[PDB]
Amino acid sequence: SPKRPYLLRAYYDWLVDNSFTPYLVVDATYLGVNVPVEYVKDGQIVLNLSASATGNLQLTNDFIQFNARFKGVSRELYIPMGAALAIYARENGDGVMFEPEEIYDELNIEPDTEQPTGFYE
């Protein structure tokens, strides 16, 4: 239902097809993000999604996932689509900042915690 995944994939292809290095701005504060906090700045990390800087990159409707190496330390990165803030070309900044969609809001996310119930029955 959310359009963000299709728009991200569209820009990604346009970037790569034009020989641009696609940079993804991630809200490392969002629910489910999995990135090395050692490289996070002000609740925000910028990733390189080019073929070269990624292993097994997958751009799903629900998440971005890939193997990344930070100073020899290869590992997996998981980013829920709701955390993707923007994607642009490293060589010139051309890209898009994703428009907010109501569904990536925890209010629209199914109950993460249950209702106050008694105990006895």
- Which residues within the stretch 50-109 sit at the binding site for a copy of itself (CB under 8 A)? 92, 94
3 Cβ contact partners less than 8 Å away, ≥ 6 residues apart: 101
Q: Is 50 exposed, middle or buried (0-12, 13-18, 19+ CB in 10 A)?
A: middle
Q: How far is the CB of 117 from a copy of itself (least distance, A)?
A: 36
Residues across the chain: 121
Return the number of the residue (14 or 30) whose C-beta is nearest a copy of itself: 14
> Site mask, a copy of itself, residues 12-51, x = CB under 8 A?
-xx--xx-x-------------------------------
Give the helix, strand, coil percentages of the chain, each rounded to 5.
Answer: 15, 35, 50
Per CB under 8 A, residues contacting a copy of itself are 1, 3, 6-7, 9-11, 13-14, 17-18, 20, 92, 94
